[PDB]
Subunit: 144 residues, 6 copies
C-alpha cells in the first residue's frame, strides 16, 4: 500500500505525513494523452476533506492556480518517491463529490498548460538506480 | 457507519435523530460540477418514506422551496458533523421510486445558490475550525 | 420479505392472499418523473400468470382500463400496508415475457396513466395505522388535486 | 427444471419426449410488445441440433412456415403444460449459432402475423384451476 | 470437452489430431444471419499459432482462398463429427491477436457460399443420418 | 507465466532479463486488422517505469522511432521465443498512466507503424527451435514483402 500525494497551490489538503504536510491524500488517479496531441485532464480521487470546499469554488470560478504536484511514494523498508508529476498553470475542471452510509469519495479533474514527469529507478537493494525526467509546454506545443 | 441527513423546507422526512428530527435519512448522494460552469443536479437516495408523496408533488408542480440542507455526521465516539451543503432556491427535478419483494427512491435537486462547509476535527475529536465557500450559481458570482 | 400487490381493473392476477385475492403478485417495480413534467411509465415484474394473456391482449389493442392500484405491505408481526399508488385511466404500454429451463418464468410490464395518487401510511408505536400523507395529480390535466 | 418445447412446421427438432417427439428442446426464450403496437420477434435458444441446418436455410430464403407452437411444461409430480404460445404465418428472422470447447448454443428469432396465448392455472393440489386464452391478428391489427 | 477444427485452404494450423492434421484447433466460434438476408462474418478464436502469420497476411492483402471447413466433434466414447460448416470463396476480414503474462487470437471470415451439415447420432453412437442445407449467399440462391 | 518484452529504439525499459536487458516488460497487449485494410494501433500495458517519461514525451512530440520489437517467450524448462512482432517506423499514439494506493501503477500505451513483420517460431520435440513461419507487409506502401 503505497502513498499518493497531491500538492495544489492555494488549496490545502489535510495530510499528516511528515514530508507532505497539508497536502491532499490521493486514493487513485489517471491521465491520458492521445494523437498536435490531445491532452486529457488528469483525474484523481480523494476523501471529502479540507480541500473540497475550495475545489468546489475553483471549479465554479475557473480561476487558475500556479502549480499542482502529484507524487507516488513506495511503501515499506525503502520508501522511494519514484514518480512525480508537476503540472503548471492549473484549472480545476471537474468536481464530483459523493457520500454513503455504508464512505466519502470525491473525484476531481485538472487541466494544465505545461507538464513535467520525473521517474526514479529503484534497484533490488532498494536504493536509487537512476532517474528520467521529461517536460513539455502543452499550451505552447514545444519541448522544454 | 456515518449518518447523512437532508432537511428540505416544506418537505419533512421521518428521522428520529435528536438533532435532526423530521429530516430525511439519506442512504447515499452525489453531485457534479463541470467546466460558465455546468452545475449538475444533486441526487440522493432514501427509503420510500413520509417525504415521498410530497417529493412526487413537487416534482410534478415544479414549485420551488427556499432551502435544502445536507449534512454528513461521523460515526463513533466523536460524532462530528463535518460536511454541510446548503442549497438555496431548490427545485425537485426528478423522483424515481422502486420496490422489491427481496424499497428505495432516488431524488434529484437543482438550486440557484450553494454553500459548502467542511468542519475540521481536532485531535480531541472536537471542532478545530472550518473551511467554507459559497457561490451564486444563478448569478454566476462568488459570495 | 415484504408483499407487493397490483390490482388492475378487468385484469385479474392469481394471488391467494386474503386481503388481495385475485390481484397480481409483484416481484419488483419502478417509476420515474423528470422535469411541464415528464412522467414515465410505471414498470413492474411478475411471474407469467393468469394476468399474462390479458396483459398481452391489452398491450396489442391499446384499450384503457379504469384503475390500477399498487400496494406495498411490510412483512412480519405488523403487516402494514404502507404505500398505495393509485393510477387512473391506465394503458398497458409494454409486455416482455421470458422463460428458462433452469428455474423461473417472468414478465416485465409497463403502464401509463392520466392521474396518480400516492398515499404513505405512517406507522404508530404499536405497529398500527397512525395516519397518512397523501398527494395527487392530474397528469393529463397538468393540475394538482 | 421445467421443460420448454418449440414445434415449428416443416422444421423438426430432436426431442425424445413422449408428448413432444421431434420438437425443438428450448433452453430459454423471450418476446416483447411495445406501444398500432410494435411487436418484436420472439427469440429462443437451443443447442445446435437437427433443426439448425433448416433454420439457417429459412433465415436465408425468408420462406414462411404455417405455424410455430411454444410450450412450457412444469416439472415434478404434477407436470402441467401451463403456457402455450401459438404463432401463425412465421418467418425465421435471425439465426446465431456458436460453439465452444468448454457447449453449443444457437439463438433464433421468429416473426409472425398472428398470435395466441393460453395460460393454465394450477392449484395447490396440482390440478387445473382454470385457463385464460387470448389471441390477436397482428398483421390485420384486430382482436380474434 | 468437444473438439472444434477449422481447415482453411492455404493456411495450415498445427493440430496433431489424427483425422485433422495441420488444421487449426478452434477454441470457440460464432456466426449470424439477419433478415436479401444480411449474413455476418463467421468469427473464431484460436491460440496464436503457425496459422497466425498467414492469417495476418491474408487479412492485409484481402486475397481469397477457395474453402474453409469448420467441424465440431463430440467428446467421449463415441467421438462423432456432428456439425460441418463448409465456406466457399473465403476472405480473411479481421485478425485480433493478443497476449498476456497471466495468448489468443480472434479471426473473422466472409464467404460467397455456405453449406451446413448436421450428423444425426444413432442410439449405438454411430451415424444415423444427416440433415443438410446449402446456399449461394453471393448469388442469393438455394443450392 | 510467460514473459512478454517490447524493445523500442531510443526508449529503454528497465527489464533485468538476461536476453532482454533494458527492454520494457509487457503485462499484456492486443492489436487489430480490419477489412485497403484498416490497421489499428497496437496497444500494450506495462507498469509505470523508466520508459514512461519518454513515452509521454514522444506521445506529445509525435516524433518517430525506427523500430519496436515485441516478443513472447514461453515459461518453463524450454523458454522458447515463439512470437516476434517487428514494427518499423513507429509513433507513440497514446499514453494512459494511472495509480492507486491499494496495490499497482500501470500504463496503457498505443503504437502505430508503417511496416510490420510477424514471425512464429515452431517448436521441435526437444523444446528447441524447429523452424519458423514468417510474413511481412508494408502497410504504408500497401504491399506484401
Amino acid at each position: 500500500a503505497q502513498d499518493i500525494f497531491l500538492k495544489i497551490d492555494g488549496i490545502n489538503g489535510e495530510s499528516l505525513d511528515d514530508s507532505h504536510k497539508d497536502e491532499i491524500e490521493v486514493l487513485n488517479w489517471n491521465w491520458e494523452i492521445q494523437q498536435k496531441a490531445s491532452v486529457k485532464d488528469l483525474t484523481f480521487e480523494h476523501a471529502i476533506d479540507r480541500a473540497s470546499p475550495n475545489l468546489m469554488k475553483y471549479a465554479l470560478t475557473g480561476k487558475h492556480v500556479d502549480q499542482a504536484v502529484l507524487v507516488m511514494r513506495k511503501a515499506g523498508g525503502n520508501p522511494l518517491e519514484y514518480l512525480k508529476l508537476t503540472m503548471s498553470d492549473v484549472i480545476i475542471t471537474r468536481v464530483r463529490p459523493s457520500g454513503s452510509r455504508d464512505r466519502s469519495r470525491e473525484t476531481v479533474s485538472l487541466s494544465f498548460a505545461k507538464v513535467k514527469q520525473e521517474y526514479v529507478v529503484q534497484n533490488a537493494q532498494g536504493g536509487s538506480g537512476g532517474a528520467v525526467t521529461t517536460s513539455f509546454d502543452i499550451k505552447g506545443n514545444k519541448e522544454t
